[PDB]
Design a protein around this nucleic acid. Structure first.
Ligand SMILES: [K+]
Ligand SMILES: [K+]
Ligand SMILES: [K+]
Ligand SMILES: [K+]
Ligand SMILES: [Mg+2]
Ligand SMILES: [Mg+2]
Ligand SMILES: [Mg+2]
Ligand SMILES: [Mg+2]
Ligand SMILES: [Mg+2]
Ligand SMILES: [Mg+2]
Ligand SMILES: [Mg+2]
Ligand SMILES: [Mg+2]
Ligand SMILES: [Mg+2]
Ligand SMILES: [Mg+2]
Ligand SMILES: [Mg+2]
Ligand SMILES: [Mg+2]
Ligand SMILES: [Mg+2]
Ligand SMILES: [Mg+2]
Ligand SMILES: [Mg+2]
Ligand SMILES: [Mg+2]
Ligand SMILES: [Mg+2]
Ligand SMILES: [Mg+2]
Ligand SMILES: [Mg+2]
Ligand SMILES: [Mg+2]
Ligand code: NA
Ligand code: NA
Ligand code: NA
Lengths: 59, 260, 130, 183, 71, 141
RNA sequence: AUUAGGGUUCGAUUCCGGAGAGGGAGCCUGAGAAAUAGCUACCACUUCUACGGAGGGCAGCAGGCGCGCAAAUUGCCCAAUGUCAAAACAAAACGAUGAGGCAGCGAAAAGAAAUAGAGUUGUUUGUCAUUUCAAUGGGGGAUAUUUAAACCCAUCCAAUAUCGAGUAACAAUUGGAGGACAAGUCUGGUGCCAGCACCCGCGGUAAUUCCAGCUCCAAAAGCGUAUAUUAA
């Protein structure tokens, strides 16, 4: 019971506006951007594992 | 009764495109069977290209400009078929409706004194009132006084202009025939033997000029000459000789490269 | 490498046939227009074909079904050359005659004709058609 | 209704949506050949799958089989004409060894870059899509145009393109109009 | 066929035994059909006899064949 | 073990036919008991009218009040319980409102910690519930 | 449709065959009908009426009302494909045809394909901050072409003489980022609540899972979800 709590967290969440950023390339240009960043930007060290979304230290 | 004919249901030998129309011209009853005929409209529009569409085909046909067996036929649904002679006097066109090696209809050009002759396979023999012997032919002709030696399965070479029988070729072994039905339609060969199965289909075993042996039902053979050397009618370009598919593809490829 | 030159049209016929039944000559007509801007008018092609085939009057030449080739510079259509203007006016379809200016006036709307037919089928004589 | 125009599919999705090895390999192919999506690779995959399937079927049959002779000659001729296999390789077993890059190299987008008419594969694709490349004097605007060996020597700039024998392009034409109007 | 019953006047029942193939299991099963056949008084066959029958016009509600030879 | 005779097709056909009924999925597809008991009657979606809003306690070891609505189907007047996905979407629903109901993704089986709930609300007032949740559309007045 | 093979499953629906024209029955005409935009009757629904009476059968086209999770225009035309017919076309002189064809609506499904390309300077490379050059369609138009007429395509932006990309704002989405399963020990919020979660599970004050920002992953003019079915 007590249906009055529906949507509690969504209402509580502070509204943060999306940052305005320049458009990314669409289509073939986007694919070439991903390919260049993944295989042309840096040389993969033998034995290392590529971190696609490595984050800064936290906790 | 059925008055229409769906284009998909039309015979494949008419070469009508499945995308151009829903219907095909339904052949009327007449000399030849619906499944074994070529309509006059198809001949005048799709084969001879004298008419761009059916309306121009109607223009040509209604004026009696097209003659079949020395008689103007004004119906585009007229069922022209095997061994028929089609003449357009205005354009000086004369050809016989025959089968090529691949079983398709072919317009074999004829000269004068050749367009006056037509071969008719005897399909039935009966007695009319007055004890008159009558022969029924493959094109629906009824002959009031055939030769006494005439038999069912024989062929009568018949003068269309003078409307009289001039010769008879018996249906016997060693005679040259052309196949009018089945997978072997259009092949020309000599009767090697005929197997008789009473109450069922007789089987004719034939051999072409190159020596290839083939067979069919006796109803599908059409005697056209005493032997392969002396035919009694002009035949299409390939002379009824089936040719190996691999060799045909190679020759066409070589001929195409020779052209270019 | 570009050069400014006056555009020229070359006419070229294929699959030529003489149709004595309909008193005309049939052929595929191909038009080469290298530097032409847009599409070649069929009237201009009619003049060129009449001159090319020695037709005394260009009005006996019937052209239709002109498809331009992708990439430009070419157009392919069909052509009819009649023995005389009388044969053309007698055998040509009405819509092509209208394209030439020789066509008849358009009939009333078929819906109105169907409306009149259905009304009349309820009546006896001297009322039908009125 | 009562329409008999045939149509069929030319590509199929992979069985496992997320394989690291396959995804990396396809990403390499897309960047190397300037492709727009994975569907362009999958179209080549289905084509090769069809060719290998009939090749396997023919090789099951004995040599003297007429179907193997006719069909085997046809497919080898097709491979030789389109450059999938070298002229030296004249055995049906070499059809089985065809790889995806073998087909992708014959694309007009790849051939134009290899011939030297474009700085890169991406420059090649936009050149093709912008009506600048003609094959045997016919303008071709499809990057996936598979080029025949006999047609390779006839690839050049289109006569109607500004890079060939045609009039000036948009930038120069608009600036020429602007110069006349401003003056 | 094989004569199955001769209890009717001038009519006999014959059996046609045959094997029917089932594709999925690559195996046969035994099936049979029964035909009512007119028997002329010139034959006198017995149960278990083998007969040859020819197709004729409908002679009754069920009869479509006539006995031609008793083996 | 099984028969192997060359003329044993009838035995093998009969054996398979009897034993297919032991397949629960096969029996469900080839019987009518499931169709009769199915409130949707074999359809992928069913339209209905909301009767009330109820809160279903989640199964252990979970602890939550899953927001659901009792819905009476228009086609056959059967009463079902349908889960309302996403937070705050219960406020998009009113009693006697008109909703579209779909399956919960397991072909009649209950999903997750919600006991005995096999349906979920997808549309309300001819507007997609997820569209209302994402504010790409507004609920008609 | 699915796919090693063997199979499993779908087939109301374009072609062929059968059956029906609200439900039943009966019948005339005719070569052919037990016909239904033919007749006769009954049953169930219905329309007009001056109350005496007279009518109706869209499972044809278009379109309404209901039913539902669920499916277009009361459009144009006989130019093509055919059918009928007393009938070639034409000449005071143009047969009918919702059969059919053509457009409108249409992200069922299928094919091709944009959303940018080359540099230059500074910050082996690469990113970033600059700065240039050219190209092109979307679109706007036409001496025109197409078409029965239009509309779509195609052709062109002078042939003496033809508009147009820089935040190219002409701005790509849909689902996800513990595991199956590609992608975060990120930052806030919430605190077994809200919710997520197909399954395992997450949330009870340090949440890799909820609500958001950032970043990233996957497919891409498409992408989720439900049900059914095939493989698994
Ligand atoms: K309707
Ligand atoms: K989520
Ligand atoms: K956190
Ligand atoms: K998140
Ligand atoms: Mg559990
Ligand atoms: Mg069906
Ligand atoms: Mg049904
Ligand atoms: Mg039907
Ligand atoms: Mg009927
Ligand atoms: Mg009804
Ligand atoms: Mg009828
Ligand atoms: Mg009736
Ligand atoms: Mg009606
Ligand atoms: Mg009635
Ligand atoms: Mg229709
Ligand atoms: Mg729909
Ligand atoms: Mg007239
Ligand atoms: Mg549309
Ligand atoms: Mg855009
Ligand atoms: Mg444009
Ligand atoms: Mg169109
Ligand atoms: Mg992972
Ligand atoms: Mg799932
Ligand atoms: Mg997850
Ligand atoms: Na017989
Ligand atoms: Na151009
Ligand atoms: Na018509």
């Amino acid at each position: 019971g007590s249906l009055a709590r529906a949507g509690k967290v969504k209402n509580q969440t502070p509204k943060v506006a999306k940052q305005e950023k320049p458009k990314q390339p669409r289509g073939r240009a986007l694919k070439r951007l991903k390919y260049t960043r993944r295989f042309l930007s840096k040389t993969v060290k033998p034995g290392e594992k590529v971190h696609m979304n490595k984050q800064p230290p936290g906790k | 009764a059925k008055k229409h004919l769906k284009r998909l249901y039309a015979p494949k030998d008419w070469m009508l495109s499945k995308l151009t129309g829903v219907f095909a011209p339904r052949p009327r009853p007449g000399p030849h069977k619906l499944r074994e005929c070529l309509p006059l409209l198809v001949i005048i529009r799709n084969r001879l290209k004298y008419a761009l569409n059916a309306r121009e085909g109607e223009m040509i046909l209604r004026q009696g400009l097209v003659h079949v067996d020395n008689h103007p036929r004004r119906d585009g649904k007229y069922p022209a078929g095997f061994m028929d002679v089609v003449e357009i006097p205005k354009t000086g066109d004369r050809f016989r409706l025959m089968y090529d090696v691949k079983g398709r209809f072919a317009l074999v050009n004829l000269s004068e004194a050749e367009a006056q002759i037509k071969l008719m396979k005897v399909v039935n023999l009966y007695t009319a009132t007055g004890r008159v012997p009558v022969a029924v032919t493959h094109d629906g002709h009824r002959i009031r006084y055939p030769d006494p030696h005439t038999s069912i399965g024989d062929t009568i070479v018949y003068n269309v202009k003078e409307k009289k029988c001039v010769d008879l070729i018996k249906n016997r072994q060693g005679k040259a025939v052309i196949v009018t039905g089945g997978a072997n339609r259009g092949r020309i060969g000599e009767i090697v033997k005929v197997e008789c199965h009473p109450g069922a289909f007789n089987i004719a075993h034939l051999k072409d000029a190159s020596g290839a042996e083939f067979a069919t039902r006796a109803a599908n053979i059409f005697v056209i000459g005493k032997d392969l050397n002396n035919l009694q009618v002009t035949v299409p370009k390939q002379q009824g000789l089936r040719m190996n598919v691999i060799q045909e593809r190679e020759e066409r490829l070589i001929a195409a490269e020779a052209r270019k | 490498v570009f050069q400014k030159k006056k555009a020229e049209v070359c006419i070229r016929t294929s699959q030529f046939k003489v149709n004595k039944l309909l008193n005309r000559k049939q052929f595929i007509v191909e038009v080469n227009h290298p530097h032409w801007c847009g599409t070649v008018p069929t009237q201009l092609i009619r003049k060129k074909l009449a001159t090319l085939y020695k037709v005394p009057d260009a009005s006996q030449v019937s052209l239709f079904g002109f498809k331009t080739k992708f990439g430009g510079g070419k157009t392919t259509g069909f052509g009819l050359i009649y023995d005389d203007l009388a044969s053309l006016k007698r055998f040509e379809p009405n819509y092509r005659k209208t394209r030439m200016g020789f066509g008849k006036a358009r009939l009333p709307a078929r819906k109105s004709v169907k409306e009149r037919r259905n009304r009349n089928k309820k009546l006896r004589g001297k009322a039908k058609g009125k | 209704m009562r329409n008999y125009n045939n149509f069929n599919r030319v590509w199929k999705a992979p069985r496992r949506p997320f394989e690291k090895e396959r995804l990396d390999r396809e990403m390499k192919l897309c960047g190397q050949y300037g492709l727009r999506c994975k569907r362009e690779i999958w179209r080549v995959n289905m084509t090769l799958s069809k060719m290998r399937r009939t090749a396997r079927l023919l090789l099951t049959l004995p040599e003297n089989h007429p179907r193997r002779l006719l069909e085997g000659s046809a497919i080898m001729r097709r491979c030789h004409e389109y450059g999938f296999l070298d002229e030296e390789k004249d055995k049906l077993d070499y059809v089985l060894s065809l790889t995806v890059p073998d087909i992708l190299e014959r694309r007009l987008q790849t051939i134009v870059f290899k011939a030297g008419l474009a700085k890169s594969v991406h420059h090649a694709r936009v050149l093709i899509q912008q009506r600048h490349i003609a094959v045997a004097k016919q303008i071709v605007t499809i990057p996936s145009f598979i080029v025949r060996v006999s047609s390779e020597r006839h690839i050049a700039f289109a006569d109607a393109s500004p890079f060939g024998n045609g009039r000036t392009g948009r930038v120069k034409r608009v600036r020429a109009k602007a110069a006349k109007r401003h003056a | 066929g094989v004569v199955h019953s001769t209890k009717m006047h001038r009519t006999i029942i014959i059996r046609r035994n045959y094997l029917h193939f089932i594709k999925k299991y690559q195996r046969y099963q035994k099936r049979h059909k029964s035909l009512a056949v007119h028997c002329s008084p010139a034959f006198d066959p017995k149960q278990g006899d083998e007969v040859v029958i020819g197709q004729c016009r409908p002679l009754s509600k069920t009869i479509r064949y006539n006995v031609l030879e008793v083996v | 073990t099984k028969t192997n005779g060359q003329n044993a097709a009838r035995k093998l056909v009969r054996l398979r036919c009897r034993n297919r009924w032991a397949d629960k999925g096969w029996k469900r597809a080839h019987t009518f008991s499931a169709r009769k008991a199915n409130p949707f009657g074999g359809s992928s979606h069913a339209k209905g009218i909301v009767l009330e809003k109820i809160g279903v306690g989640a199964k252990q070891p979970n602890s939550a009040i899953r927001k659901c609505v009792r819905v009476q189907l228009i086609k056959n007047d059967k009463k079902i319980i349908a889960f309302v996905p996403n937070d705050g979407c219960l406020h998009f629903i009113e009693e006697n409102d008109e909703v579209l109901v779909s399956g919960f993704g397991r072909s009649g089986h209950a999903v997750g910690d919600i006991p005995g709930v096999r349906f979920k609300i997808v549309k309300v007032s001819n507007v997609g519930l997820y569209a209302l949740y994402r504010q790409k559309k507004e609920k008609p007045r």
